[PDB]
Amino acid sequence: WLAFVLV
Amino acid sequence: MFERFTDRARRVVVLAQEEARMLNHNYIGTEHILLGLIHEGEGVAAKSLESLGISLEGVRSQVEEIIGQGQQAPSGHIPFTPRAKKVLELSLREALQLGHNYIGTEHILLGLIREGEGVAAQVLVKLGAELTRVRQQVIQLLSGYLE
């Protein structure tokens, strides 16, 4: 969260 | 906040990345979220879109027309676009306002039409699904589950 899957 | 996504909503987001990868795209945009919501095929978002005549093929054709593919498929993590980020942030508030503590597929769809401006929104309008009509369809199906 919130730039990539799943960050 | 991804930990508050339902299993199926997490599968949507994971699939959206691959929707981008297989089109040789280098960002996960709103349109890949739309593709993933439909392609995953079981939740209230998918049901709502199917019930408005928005098909995976219609969306694919519009994405090819509007965006087009790159030359090569990337490896590794593909970043969200600014508008995809906005959609996922908005999804949290769609869920809370509808009385849910987890973010389901329908809340991602509702976030996408709330953002209302990116490639997915453009595609939905082009395919004949006005954003207020999409929202009301989600509400209509959710109301049927209260029976």
Side-chain angles (χ1 to χ4, degrees), chain A residues 1 3-7, chain B:
Chain A
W1 187 263
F4 303 98
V5 171
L6 286 171
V7 178
Chain B
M1 298 69 250
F2 285 131
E3 72 280 4
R4 294 158 41 190
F5 282 45
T6 66
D7 280 13
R8 190 181 287 128
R10 291 183 197 172
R11 288 198 296 272
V12 163
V13 177
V14 172
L15 181 60
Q17 178 169 225
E18 306 315 308
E19 299 292 344
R21 199 183 308 279
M22 298 291 102
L23 296 172
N24 305 349
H25 292 160
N26 295 124
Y27 301 82
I28 308 175
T30 65
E31 73 280 18
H32 302 108
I33 297 173
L34 180 60
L35 287 166
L37 287 163
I38 295 165
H39 200 181
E40 183 67 13
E42 295 178 12
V44 174
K47 176 75 163 181
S48 294
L49 292 162
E50 176 184 39
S51 78
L52 293 171
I54 301 296
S55 80
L56 193 61
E57 285 293 300
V59 173
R60 291 189 191 282
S61 295
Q62 296 305 317
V63 172
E64 293 307 347
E65 176 72 31
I66 296 166
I67 308 299
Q69 302 186 199
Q71 293 181 107
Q72 69 174 25
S75 296
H77 311 287
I78 306 182
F80 296 120
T81 68
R83 293 183 188 277
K85 291 165 57 59
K86 180 156 172 183
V87 166
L88 293 169
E89 184 155 337
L90 291 170
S91 77
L92 312 178
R93 297 131 68 176
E94 305 293 304
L96 285 166
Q97 291 180 89
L98 286 165
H100 287 271
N101 32 56
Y102 291 99
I103 300 92
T105 67
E106 61 270 31
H107 306 120
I108 298 175
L109 177 56
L110 289 166
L112 181 154
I113 66 179
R114 183 72 61 206
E115 191 281 338
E117 290 178 2
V119 178
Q122 293 161 221
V123 167
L124 286 170
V125 166
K126 196 153 172 208
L127 295 175
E130 199 244 353
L131 305 181
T132 296
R133 171 159 168 259
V134 180
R135 183 173 303 108
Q136 295 310 120
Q137 188 78 163
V138 175
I139 293 174
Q140 198 74 231
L141 292 172
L142 289 173
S143 295
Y145 309 138
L146 292 176
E147 293 304 333

